[model samples]
Target chain A: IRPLVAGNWKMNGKGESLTELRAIAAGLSSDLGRKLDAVICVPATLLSRAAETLEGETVGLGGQDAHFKTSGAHTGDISPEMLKEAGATHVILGHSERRTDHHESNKLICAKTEAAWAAGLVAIVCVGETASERKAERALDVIGDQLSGSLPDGVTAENTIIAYEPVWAILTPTVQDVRAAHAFMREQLIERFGAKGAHLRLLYGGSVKPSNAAELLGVADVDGALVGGASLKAADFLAICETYRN
Target chain B: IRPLVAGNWKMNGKGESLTELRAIAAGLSSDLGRKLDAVICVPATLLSRAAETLEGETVGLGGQDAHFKTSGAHTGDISPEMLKEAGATHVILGHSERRTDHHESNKLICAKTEAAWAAGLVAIVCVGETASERKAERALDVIGDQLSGSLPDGVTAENTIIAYEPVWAIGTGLTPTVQDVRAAHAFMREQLIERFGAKGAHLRLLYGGSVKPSNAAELLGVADVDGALVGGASLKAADFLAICETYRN
Candidate 1:
């Protein structure tokens, strides 16, 4: 699998942020683009403008979240179909922020994942444990439960990428700990889906930045990095993606 | 105050729906525009497009909802400043669907209202009674509490428009019970005046929900019925424009 460096801009970004996207587009080296996959999942409001800016670039545009339904009377919710209409190629689901702020259950994330597939968008399913779970030594157990409940059947390597983001380690994670988590996730995926799971890219997301990109991206079975804050700036994001280059 | 006919498209529009807005823009007569105020509150995705479609026309564009902050880390939320940037001149707050689906309190709605004002957008503050409350004869009491809690102190006729949408009567209302509507509106007007003085009376009170063309004339005829918030009917321009034509006549 090509290494994927996905950016979750979270609730940040606006019309002005499109300039950063333009800079990222102009700054990308064809050598890196051919070897790695890069995606920037922006807030819904800026998705269309960002897509227009990127145009024919290899950098994929995405939405931070999407509703499970195609369309209806759910006020303030953007459906997967609508996101697709607005030019989203991928969608981030079950991010830790969404789970905590909106009280989203794994079951709902599964439904949204299915909707993303229906809308012809790749689903970047995020699974993570909170601070308390890590302290209790139940981090892996919690991740296991989340992955089992959040991901649906028929999710192929083409349509799904699993991102393991430790909420507690968002800004602090030892390189060894990240490697262990990615290895464990890879084992679980292969066990559950056999050969197909092995082909699926597993991303380690938590306070990923320019300083630790090379070290973390070099970890065993760590196929890519799901970047947060560092992704906001084109320079930092491009520098991080450069680490994946040969 | 001039009568206002506002359309809440709710969560039922997409890019294709811009054609409807275009038709509404072309179909609106300049005469009617001069006599009445018309606003279409669409989903956030459609706000900018709708504003562009109605650019040179008198028809105003609005947003279905807006966040209280200028901008922040709240996912899936559109800020008031963003709404204004999208060309929305107004925003709907405290709608029944939002109140029920999001568990929003009147205090939160008030905060959003203040945000709308801060962004220089007119606020269409919504208040109403549920079926249970109306059955228990607490309709006025509930509306009274919502109006008091949901509206801020600095609200003026230029900045605010009150929409009364009875949750129970959303798809269905009393045919001739002008008495109930008048009594409720009169009490609101009195309370508003007591709080903001005589300037508050200039704030138009809109009676919303299931307001069709046939019944619109009577609803507009009622005392203090300064406007109508049309939902389903407004999707068809003729039906919504029908409400505005004879409203002043």
Candidate 2:
């Protein structure tokens, strides 16, 4: 089971930020690359340039989100195919921000997942309960509904990565909460597809800072992190990526 | 008036589409450049590349849409600042498609317009009524409400271009409908003559609705039509530039 530490800069970064992007790629150790996967999902505006910067580097490139269609009349929407064309090997779907901003439904996320797969890019579908649900102790119910509806039948290790983002938490789990949430996620996946999902990576995202990264990454069932905020800085992202070293 | 023929390629175009884009810029004549303005608003995916392609050419570069924010946590949203950085001289705001798809309110459009201006990018504010409104013959009311709500106090020829797209039509007006519609639009601009008065009349007004090289010139003859926002015909430089030639006289 290979782990992936993906830094999602989200709606941030300009050409100058490529300095940080390049450093992350350069800082990645080949030895660590062998043990873990590193990806930086940048804003669509940066995708084309980031692809060039990270080319042949161990750090992979990704788009923050994409439209479900390959191409169409959806103005201001980034198509999965366009992301693929721009050199994205991965795409973040249904992030907490997306759900909150666009109010995207699971069905919409699922369709976008299929779109990502069609473009041969891995889809990182984020699922999490809001603070209200967590307060009600209904996190599991909310998470399960989101997971069940967001993931379709075609999920495989290569094409899918589930990011457990707390709607309240980049968008978290307490170490205990992560363990339980990621564990439940694994069960749901394996139950749905048996062996096909056996290797599906379950990522824990929510205030996944470099300060607590080692402890958080060490948690059982949390294969990696869907990092935000701190991911904007190279040293911080690398520190989080450093967790895989041990 | 320096009539502008801006092509809104819409949510269409790929890398291969650059061939047509280059040809459009290449086919532009200095004579036309002297008498008119030309702009092509490509998708966000093509903005950077299009900027590079159209540089030093007579044609201008633009973005199909931009978030009202300069930049922030709005995932997958293109920011106006980003558009400016991408070499966009202008941006389309409040398109019928954006209104219907995103359900963007007029206040929201106005906010985005200010954002566009803040980035030094000219804002193309689109106002239109659906077929329902047209049928109810409340087209003028709907259009007025949209115009009032969509355009703020800062509108100027240098900063904004009002696109009258019939939500039914890119988004049309019949010759009869067109004359009345554009006339009312002209009047609306004139009426805005308060803070916007003297300069309001000069705010470039563009017509968007499946314009073709065939009907292109006639479309311009409609009341107060300062330009055309080409859609499908824009995919090919031959069709789009043909419309550009209509202003040759």
Candidate 3:
């Protein structure tokens, strides 16, 4: 699988931010974008507008989150079908922000993953440990638990991509720590799904920016990046994408 | 204040549903729409599209819910500013559906109400009693508690509209209970008057749930029922407009 550099805009982006998306879309070439799969998971409000603006462009449009059900009475929740209808090609599920802020459980995220596949959108499922877990030397164990609980059965490389965003390391991190975490995740996936796991793209997220993109992308088992704040700005996002290109 | 016939689309409406919205818009006249405020609070995904499609039409656009913050790390939340930018002149805060599904408290709903005013959108704050509370004769007490906790200080007629949706009544037809609804609205009016004085009189109280055109005249005739919050019926233009026509005279 080619490296998938996905941008989780989180609870950001508005009508004005479409300009930045336009810039990023215009800046990216089909060759580079195809070579390194670039996706921007925007807020729900901006999904349709982004989809309209980025139409026929290389950069893929996505939603930051989606409800597990296809449709129902889950207020304030965008369903996978809704996302797909709004022109989302992928969805970012179980982000630490959502898990912490909205009390989303791994079990719920597993349902959302299945829903995403059902809706025909790729599910970028996120897994990470907290600061205390890292301090207690239980990061790998926490990751293992979350991975097992969050992902659903019958997931393929085509429908699922795993993103490792260490909540502790999100603020700051050492290269060695990130490499070890990614390598561990890669091994875990290989063990769980055998040869199919090798094709599933493993993205490293946490304070990933243009400045650190090259070094982090160079890390072993780091297929690409799940970018945060840096992804908001087109130039910064494009800069990060350029790193993978080289 | 004109009787505002608002439609809370709730967790429904999709891209294809714009055709229905267009029908609703085309069916409503500028004169009648202006005389009686018509708003549709759609899902976040369709807000901008609705706003754009409903532009120049008398019908107003609104959001089902909004986050208290202007912007930031509340994932899966739509902000009041975003709603405003998407052409929403009003926003439904503290809907029963939201309070139940998202575990929202009256205090949080208050913050959201304040945020709605901050973003320049009229806040349609909903208050009601569940089946048990009503069964225990605590409907008034529940409404009173919600009214006190959900509303913020300095609310005016322009910024605030109250909605009373009985959890029991939402799923059932209710032309027969017009007097029952009137009693509740009258009590709500008295409570608002005691808390904030005459400015409360300017506050429009909307009766919501299972409201249809057949009984809309009787419901509109009820004392203090400044409007109706139609849900399923609002999806169709003719049905929603029928409710609004009760106030045409």
- Which sections of candidate 2 miss by over 4 Å? A170-172, B170-177
For A22-64, candidate 2 gives per-residue lDDT tens digits of 8887787567667888899887777777788887888888888
- Candidate 1 lDDT over A42-148, as tens digits, reads 87666766778889998998887888888766656778887787778999999887888677899999999999999999999999898899999998999999998
Kindly list the per-residue Cα lDDT of model 3 for residues A175-230, writing each as its tens digit: 89889998888788888888888888989987888898999888888889998889
What DockQ class does candidate 1 belong to?
acceptable
Off by over 4 Å in 1: A169-171, B171-180, B246-248
Return the DockQ of model 1. Answer: 0.49
TM-score of each: 0.92, 0.95, 0.95
Worst 10-residue lDDT window for candidate 2 chain B reads B168-177
Pairs of residues clashing in candidate 1: none
Off by over 4 Å in 3: B170-176
DockQ of each: 0.49, 0.64, 0.65
Worst 10 contiguous positions by lDDT, candidate 3 chain A = A69-78
Docking class of 2: medium
Per-residue lDDT tens digits for candidate 2, residues B150-189, read 8878788689898877665532344335665566567556
Top model by DockQ, which number?
A: 3
Please give the RMSD of candidate 2 to the true structure.
2.1
Ranking by DockQ: 3, 2, 1
